[PDB]
Design a binder for this molecule. Structure first.
Ligand SMILES: O=C1c2cccc3cccc(c23)C(=O)N1CCCN1CCOCC1
Ligand SMILES: *[C@@H]1O[C@H](CO)[C@@H](O)[C@H](O)[C@H]1NC(C)=O
Length: 377
């Protein structure tokens, strides 16, 4: 069992996966309690009053999604509530909060009351990102860094006496890490740091790339857009290995290629890939959408024989990069070899939890669990 192990497996639950057709529909009761040590509920949002609030009252409150996920505490799983996320990070409201000591003080007391009201074990900060709002480092003030560190301290000061957890999902990007994070402060106060070692590449690059490279590849634009650099950089900035959980994507980044007879890495891309039937987001495909394309629609899969990155797959002018079971076992062995705190997955609802692709239920998450529980490295 993962609960008796030395590792965390932090699983992100998303409340919007309920709004998906057919087998893509995912509910709190679909969570497999044998596959996680920690569940993080995404997302609460920052209201206009500067207070944490439910993002989707119909699911979170009226259909009791908060309660139905907090239910998993009965298994010994720690259930935290995540604040923020990509969409909620678009504007300046998180920056206005952290730069205002009075606003932080009000926010912190209300947030802790919020957590205890619904029985959450902790809070997960997912501002994307301090200073570099949605990875645009020209947008936010440098004081976002000190303000975020002060917010983490003031939260920690209230949560820790109550035995509540405080964690943060953080950028894998070296420039964002430098600009937004007071790493020694965060490393000391957070119970764990979920490094989002994915989305290194996507349609915004205007060329094909892998969503989550593990190691440097000789054709890479940079030396630091890979999980190996990112994790070592967080530790170099002062993070203990035991506080790091390494994120792994349960999805792929998809691309519409120009289709000048080529389909490898770094080829020109005109747009995100066509949206999937279930996730309905251009540039994005769940793992269970990807394996159906490979198994039943004849997409061609290219693997890296050196296992520096997961596979990619293509058909026509459509191209998607993702993690399969093989690279995931390599990544978990990477986690164990560095004695990291454990792993994190985005997200529960994107793995093949229905066994639509015939490799068993939850093939990616079961591969992580199996490798984490294997003593050999
Ligand atoms: O990193 C970027 C990004 C970076 C730089 C420019 C962009 C322009 C448009 C869209 C994105 C970006 C973008 O969507 N992302 C992914 C963040 C959410 N990911 C988390 C898990 O699932 C969903 C994907
Ligand atoms: C991983 O990163 C470290 C430091 O950034 C580097 O020394 C090492 O060569 C990298 N490993 C691989 C396999 O690239």
């Amino acid at each position: 069992s993962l609960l008796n192990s030395r590792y965390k497996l932090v699983c992100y639950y998303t409340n919007w996966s309920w709004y998906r057709p057919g087998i893509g529909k995912y509910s709190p009761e679909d969570i497999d309690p044998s596959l996680c040590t920690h569940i993080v509920y995404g997302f609460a949002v920052l209201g206009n009053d500067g207070l944490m609030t439910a993002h989707d009252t119909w699911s979170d409150y009226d259909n009791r999604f908060y309660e139905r996920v907090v239910e998993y505490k009965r298994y010994g799983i720690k259930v935290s509530l995540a604040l923020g996320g990509w969409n909620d990070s678009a504007g300046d409201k998180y920056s206005k909060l952290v730069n205002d000591p009075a606003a932080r003080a009000k926010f912190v007391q209300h947030a802790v009351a919020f957590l205890e009201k619904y029985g959450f074990d902790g809070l997960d900060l997912d501002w994307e990102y301090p200073k570099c709002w949605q990875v645009d480092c020209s947008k936010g003030p440098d004081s976002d860094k000190q303000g975020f560190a002060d917010l983490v301290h003031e939260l920690s000061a209230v949560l820790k006496p109550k035995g509540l957890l405080l964690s943060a999902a953080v950028s894998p990007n070296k420039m964002v890490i430098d600009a937004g994070y007071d790493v020694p402060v965060l490393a000391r106060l957070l119970d764990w740091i979920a490094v989002m070692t994915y989305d290194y590449h996507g349609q915004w690059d205007k060329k094909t790339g892998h969503v989550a490279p593990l190691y440097y590849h000789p054709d890479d634009d940079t030396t630091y857009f890979n999980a190996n650099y990112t994790i070592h950089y967080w530790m170099e900035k002062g993070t203990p290995a035991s506080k790091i959980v390494m994120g792994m994507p349960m999805y792929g980044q998809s691309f519409t290629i120009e289709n000048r007879g080529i389909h490898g890495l770094n080829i020109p891309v005109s747009d995100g890939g066509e949206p999937g039937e279930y996730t309905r987001a251009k540039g994005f495909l769940a793992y269970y959408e990807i394996c159906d394309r490979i198994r039943n629609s004849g997409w061609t899969v290219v693997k890296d024989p050196y296992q520096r990155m997961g596979p990619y797959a293509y058909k026509g002018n459509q191209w998607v990069s993702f993690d399969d079971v093989e690279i995931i076992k390599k990544k978990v062995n990477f986690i164990k070899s560095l004695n990291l705190g454990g792993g994190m997955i985005w997200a529960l609802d994107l793995d093949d939890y229905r066994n639509r692709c015939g490799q068993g239920k939850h093939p990616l998450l079961n591969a992580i669990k199996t490798e984490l529980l294997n003593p050999k490295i």
